[PDB]
Design an enzyme around this catalytic site. Structure first.
Site, short mmCIF file in Angstrom:
data_model
loop_
_atom_site.label_atom_id
_atom_site.label_comp_id
_atom_site.label_asym_id
_atom_site.label_seq_id
_atom_site.Cartn_x
_atom_site.Cartn_y
_atom_site.Cartn_z
N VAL A 60 0.83 -1.20 0.00
CA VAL A 60 0.00 0.00 0.00
C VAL A 60 0.87 1.25 0.00
O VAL A 60 0.41 2.34 -0.35
CB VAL A 60 -0.97 0.04 1.21
CG1 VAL A 60 -1.33 -1.38 1.63
CG2 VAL A 60 -0.38 0.83 2.36
N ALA A 61 2.12 1.10 0.40
CA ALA A 61 3.05 2.22 0.41
C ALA A 61 3.46 2.51 -1.04
O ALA A 61 3.56 3.67 -1.45
CB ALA A 61 4.28 1.87 1.23
N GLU A 92 -2.78 4.12 -4.72
CA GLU A 92 -4.17 3.69 -4.58
C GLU A 92 -5.24 4.63 -5.16
O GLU A 92 -6.14 4.19 -5.88
CB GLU A 92 -4.51 3.43 -3.10
CG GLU A 92 -3.90 2.17 -2.44
CD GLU A 92 -2.46 2.35 -2.01
OE1 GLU A 92 -2.17 3.36 -1.32
OE2 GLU A 92 -1.62 1.49 -2.36
N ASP A 139 -12.77 16.52 -43.65
CA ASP A 139 -13.53 16.51 -44.88
C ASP A 139 -13.73 17.99 -45.14
O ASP A 139 -13.70 18.76 -44.19
CB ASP A 139 -14.87 15.82 -44.66
CG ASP A 139 -14.77 14.32 -44.86
OD1 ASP A 139 -14.34 13.90 -45.98
OD2 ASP A 139 -15.13 13.57 -43.92
N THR A 151 -11.53 16.48 -50.15
CA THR A 151 -12.76 16.98 -50.80
C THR A 151 -13.28 16.14 -51.96
O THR A 151 -13.08 14.93 -52.03
CB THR A 151 -12.59 18.41 -51.39
OG1 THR A 151 -11.79 18.34 -52.58
CG2 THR A 151 -11.89 19.29 -50.41
N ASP A 166 -18.82 10.55 -42.12
CA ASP A 166 -20.01 10.18 -41.36
C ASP A 166 -20.82 8.98 -41.84
O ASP A 166 -21.67 8.49 -41.09
CB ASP A 166 -20.93 11.39 -41.22
CG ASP A 166 -21.53 11.82 -42.53
OD1 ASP A 166 -20.77 12.17 -43.44
OD2 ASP A 166 -22.78 11.79 -42.65
N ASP A 200 -17.02 5.42 -44.04
CA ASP A 200 -15.83 5.81 -43.30
C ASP A 200 -15.67 5.20 -41.90
O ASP A 200 -14.77 5.58 -41.16
CB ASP A 200 -15.78 7.33 -43.13
CG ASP A 200 -16.13 8.08 -44.38
OD1 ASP A 200 -15.57 7.75 -45.44
OD2 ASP A 200 -16.96 9.01 -44.28
#
Ligand SMILES: C/C=C(/C)C(=O)O[C@H]1C(C)=C2[C@H]([C@@H]1OC(=O)CCCCCCC)[C@@](C)(OC(C)=O)C[C@H](OC(=O)CCC)[C@@]1(O)[C@H]2OC(=O)[C@@]1(C)O
Ligand SMILES: Nc1ncnc2c1ncn2[C@@H]1O[C@H](COP(=O)(O)OP(=O)(O)CP(=O)(O)O)[C@@H](O)[C@H]1O
Ligand SMILES: [Mg+2]
Ligand code: NA
Length: 994
Positions: free
Chosen positions: A304-305, A309, A351, A625, A703, A707
């Site tokens: 734990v050291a 955590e 695009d 484009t 979209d 793609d």
């Protein structure tokens, strides 16, 4: 299955060997079904909670914790004192923590979703076929459709499979192939074949894709491919084949536990060697297993050291907040971990039209042939005002208002724009704005006519919901639309067949009004109309026409041109097969040019600047484009991708040019190029491969399902707010406003978040380093436990977390966007920084241990062997008269622990502040630069004091402090840390880095 679209109607009917009027026979079904299988996409796979929790316990650290929690659990049961009834806290807490994580990841993944899952939303349950075991059409479950059976679809149906069309029953068939591309614009399907075997879906005009809808019509077809073999089925494969790597941070962390682990086991090795004296001096007497418990209970402390955590909680809570943040700035980021990778984007492929431009068209220039004589040629250029599709604006020549009417060429130019247009305007009341109806480029040409009423008709005496389509309406009633010959990428143009309205315009009657790309039409032009009169096309006039067209689409104007023509004496109707596309180009020939029209798709305001930020940001930007290369470039220049006079030969390619290159050059072109013209299918995906080979963090946009594969493969696939659902599910982010700008903005928040994030990591980690030093010493000397896991836990989780998550709000640097994107391979901690926390920790480990041990020796509240004998405190009840003289249990004292811990706490509320900056003195970067940092430190302190003053809490821990005699001790120990840092920080001036 087959490559049907290239084959004839009979060729496909033969292939599968089926009857068009019968359908497949029950034997053929069973057979086909066997060979091709069922018509669906493989099922989803999702690890059960078991499988989940199992991976939730797969992290080396979380494992190390589980083992640790066990040991403690084992040690608790080993006592037998009524008072040792708290022993079951340490193990019980660790487990809670562990468990709590698993509780998260399970509810985490749990609410996620696969993009491959989204696809199955396109799979229509039912379908309609014609099979030999009945004469009427059968309605069966798509799942059961087979390659080869005759299928039937109509107006509302969802196309169940990739179908070749056999025969169209309605007078026309229309399809909504948007789930593919996103464009809501329906398309017309025919029956004749398409020659090219390597033809893109777009030109498969006799094909029906599984997923799309029948816009208008009814047709019959034969199933070509099914399941995973269909157009959409291929995609699903690509998206499943694609593997996405871990966030560089997740990388860096996994690397941490890997090491955190090696050190730990090493310490145990060292530890054992420091207490190896027990092999040559032991009186082989009792307390041999009161010594094992030591090395054991000291182990779980060590663990734990070592582990931060609370870190996980901090990070996530940081990312969430930022997410919620970005959301206000229109960036919808889906996976929290992405925010990191985003802030590291090297290249951004956007695009064009939807995001870089506004997708709001309008005609600016016009020009009709004015005069041809000899080599003397004279045009008639115009200008048109109005960016909204709104019918508001004026036509001008030399910026002087004009009455379109006074010119003939225009009157026609106008009628053509009015009859070779499948669009329209509409005015809504809800938001009183003029809205496009058909397609962007057409719904504009219609606006062009309104603005220029060739036949001066009223209108200003009409409501807006009438004004929109009241100049077109007129021309629509002067001729009759017999039919139209749709736009096809082969002949780049379209035309409508018209006959006049009897006795009003039947001068020559049957006309053909064609519009399309200038190149194509002008060739098919054998005449040019000089306003109500015609003359044979000629060398010069053709040059004059084209020349202006180049200037208009290459010049700073960056306009899209539609050359306009009419076929004065079209062929006779009966001599035309209006249902087979190849003949259209033939029907649209022997034309007479009546003028070209230019229109503009305006870059967005924020674009010009966003494009610059990226430069500053050293983030490359590539436009993708559909504009002819020539124009693509021009537009790239108008926005800043390129310089007005910069060289671009090697920086902009066309989809085709790119194929004609070797996998080798292909790669180069990418790391340098900034503009891709008319890019086909895979191109996106391929480019992401070449931009990844140079180890660049890249972003993609798009979209349609087309793609999804690229969006998944990009480090940050970007979807549109108005994009399809699959694209979104395939994207890491979503521009609610489709705006390129939104991207950058986001890339910036990402760079900001990380910086702060980066710091609180270093914060927590460092402490964890010192915590271990302590535990080491405590065991290397033999000294009684200085700190307990419980306490430690509470610390790393609370007393230390709040300041951590606090630093999350660290004001952002000013030059965040003037520095190149961060290298993913940059380590959080190394070099002289490694050295600092190397030191600091070493300090806390001394401060802490020293303080607790202090209470033992030199303290006025339970003195101890100032001769250091305390070291053998194990041996007390044994040889009591052996220098012990007093109570054999002061070692188990609580106050000494409350010392070493308060020294820690403070040392952290301190080290917290030393982290507000990596290299700036606090006298330069004062603690109040962030009020939360201070605001939290206080919240943690009061909390610390809460474990001491409450009654239940203290028992589990240590006792209260004696302020001013004990507390001041704490401070004269901790506070000195700030300086140690400042000193080491100051070492930033004695070197060359700043
Ligand atoms: C957390 C606590 C401890 C004690 C630890 O073991 O951390 C080491 C470790 C695994 C690393 C080191 C730690 O090394 C030590 O502290 C030396 C050990 C001496 C103590 C033994 C007593 C006898 C980090 C903590 O510290 C310094 C300053 O030296 C910095 C950094 O960590 C990071 O950048 C954080 C990763 C998110 C890492 O070198 C890292 O190794 C890597 O791969 C990195 C790149 O990760
Ligand atoms: N409705 C239409 N009818 C005939 N020609 C058109 C048209 N819309 C545009 N054009 C012209 O035909 C050429 C190509 O049309 P295409 O449909 O491929 O363009 P696009 O640029 O709109 C595709 P993208 O939407 O991907 O940018 C254009 O460059 C333009 O000059
Ligand atoms: Mg178009
Ligand atoms: Na992705």
């Amino acid at each position: 299955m087959e490559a049907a679209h290239s084959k004839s109607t009979e060729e496909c009917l033969a292939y599968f060997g089926v009857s068009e009027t019968t359908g497949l026979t029950p034997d053929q079904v069973k057979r086909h079904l066997e060979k091709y299988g069922h018509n669906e996409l493989p099922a989803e796979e999702g690890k059960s909670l078991w499988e989940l929790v199992i991976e939730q316990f797969e992290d080396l650290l979380v494992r190390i914790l589980l083992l640790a929690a066990c040991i403690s659990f084992v040690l608790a049961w080993f006592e037998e004192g009524e008072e040792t009834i708290t022993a079951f806290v340490e193990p019980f807490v660790i487990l809670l923590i562990l468990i709590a994580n698993a509780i998260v990841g399970v509810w985490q993944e749990r609410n996620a979703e696969n993009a491959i899952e989204a696809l199955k939303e396109y799979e229509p349950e039912m379908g309609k076929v014609y099979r030999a075991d009945r004469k009427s059409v059968q309605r069966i479950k798509a799942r059961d459709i087979v390659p080869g059976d005759i299928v039937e679809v109509a107006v509302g149906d969802k196309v169940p499979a990739d179908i070749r069309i056999l025969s169209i029953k309605s007078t026309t068939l229309r399809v909504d192939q948007s789930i593919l591309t996103g464009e809501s614009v329906s398309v017309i399907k025919h029956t004749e074949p398409v020659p090219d075997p390597r033809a893109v879906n777009q030109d498969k005009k006799n094909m029906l894709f599984s997923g799309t809808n029948i816009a208008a019509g009814k047709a019959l077809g034969i199933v070509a491919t099914t399941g995973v073999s269909t157009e959409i089925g291929k995609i699903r494969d690509q998206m499943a084949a694609t593997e996405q790597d871990k966030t560089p941070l997740q990388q860096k962390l996994d690397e941490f536990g890997e090491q955190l682990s090696k050190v730990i086991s090493l310490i145990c090795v060292a530890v054992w060697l420091i207490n190896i004296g027990h092999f040559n001096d032991p009186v082989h007497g009792g307390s041999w297993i009161r010594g094992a418990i030591y090395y054991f209970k000291i182990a779980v402390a060590l663990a734990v050291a070592a582990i931060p955590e609370g870190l996980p909680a901090v990070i996530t809570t940081c990312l969430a907040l930022g997410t919620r943040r970005m959301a206000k700035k229109n960036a919808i980021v889906r996976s929290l971990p992405s925010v990191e990778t985003l802030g590291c984007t090297s290249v951004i492929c956007s695009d064009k039209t939807g995001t870089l431009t506004t997708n709001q068209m309008s005609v600016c220039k016009m020009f009709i042939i004015d005069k041809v004589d000899g080599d003397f040629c004279s045009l008639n250029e115009f200008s048109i005002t109005g960016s909204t599709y709104a019918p508001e604006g004026e036509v001008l020549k030399n910026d002087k208002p004009i009455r379109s009417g006074q010119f003939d060429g225009l009157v026609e130019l106008a009628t053509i724009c009015a009859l070779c247009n499948d669009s329209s305007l509409d005015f809504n009341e809800t938001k009183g704005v003029y809205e496009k109806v058909g397609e962007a480029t057409e719904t504009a040409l219609t606006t062009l006519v309104e603005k220029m009423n060739v036949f001066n008709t009223e209108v200003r005496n009409l409501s807006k919901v009438e004004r929109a389509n009241a100049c077109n309406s007129v021309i629509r009633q002067l001729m009759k639309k017999e039919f139209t010959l749709e736009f096809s990428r082969d002949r780049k143009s379209m035309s409508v067949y018209c006959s006049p309205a009897k006795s009003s315009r039947a001068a020559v009657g049957n006309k053909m009004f064609v519009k399309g790309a200038p190149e194509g039409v002008i060739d098919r032009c054998n005449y040019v109309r000089v306003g109500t009169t015609r003359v044979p096309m000629t060398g010069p006039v053709k040059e004059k026409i084209l020349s202006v067209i180049k200037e208009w689409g290459t010049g700073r104007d960056t306009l899209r041109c539609l050359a306009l023509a009419t076929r004065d004496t079209p062929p006779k109707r009966e001599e035309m097969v209006l249902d087979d596309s190849s003949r259209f180009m033939e029907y649209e020939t022997d034309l007479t040019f009546v003028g070209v029209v230019g229109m503009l798709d305006p870059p967005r305001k924020e674009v010009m600047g966003s494009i610059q930020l990226c430069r500053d940001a050293g983030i490359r930007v590539i436009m993708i484009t559909g504009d002819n290369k020539g124009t693509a470039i021009a537009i790239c220049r108008r926005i800043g991708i390129f310089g007005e006079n910069e060289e671009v030969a090697d920086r902009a390619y066309t989809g085709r040019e790119f194929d004609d290159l070797p996998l080798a050059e292909q790669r180069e072109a990418c790391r340098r190029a900034c503009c891709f013209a008319r890019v086909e299918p895979s191109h996106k995906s391929k480019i992401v491969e070449y931009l990844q080979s140079y180890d660049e963090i890249t972003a993609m946009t798009g979209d349609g399902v087309n793609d999804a594969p690229a969006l998944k493969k990009a480090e940050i696939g970007i979807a549109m707010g108005s994009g399809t659902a699959v694209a979104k599910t395939a994207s890491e982010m979503v521009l609610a406003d489709d705006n390129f700008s939104t991207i950058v903005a986001a890339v910036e928040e990402g760079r900001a978040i990380y910086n702060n994030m980066k710091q609180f990591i270093r914060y927590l980690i460092s402490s964890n380093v010192g915590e271990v030093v302590c535990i080491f010493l405590t065991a290397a000397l033999g000294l009684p436990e200085a700190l307990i896991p419980v306490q430690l836990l509470w610390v790393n989780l609370v007393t230390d977390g709040l300041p951590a998550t606090a630093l999350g709000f660290n004001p952002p640097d000013l030059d965040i966007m003037d520095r190149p994107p961060r290298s993913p391979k940059e380590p959080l901690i190394s070099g002289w920084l490694f050295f600092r926390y190397m030191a600091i920790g070493g300090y806390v480990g001394a401060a802490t241990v020293g303080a607790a041990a202090w209470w033992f020796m030199y303290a006025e509240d339970g003195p101890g062997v100032t001769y250091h004998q305390l070291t053998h405190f194990m041996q007390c009840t044994e040889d009591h008269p052996h220098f012990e003289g007093l109570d054999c249990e002061i070692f188990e004292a609580p106050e000494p622990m409350t010392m070493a811990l308060s020294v820690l706490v403070t040392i952290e509320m301190c080290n917290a502040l030393n982290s507000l900056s990596e290299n700036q003195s606090l006298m330069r970067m004062p603690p109040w630069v962030n009020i939360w940092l201070l605001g939290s430190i206080c919240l943690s302190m009061s909390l610390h004091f809460l474990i001491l003053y409450v009654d239940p809490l203290p028992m589990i821990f240590k006792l209260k402090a004696l302020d001013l005699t004990q507390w001041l001790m704490v401070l004269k120990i901790s506070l000195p840390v700030i300086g140690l840092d400042e000193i080491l920080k100051f070492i930033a001036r004695n070197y060359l880095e700043g």
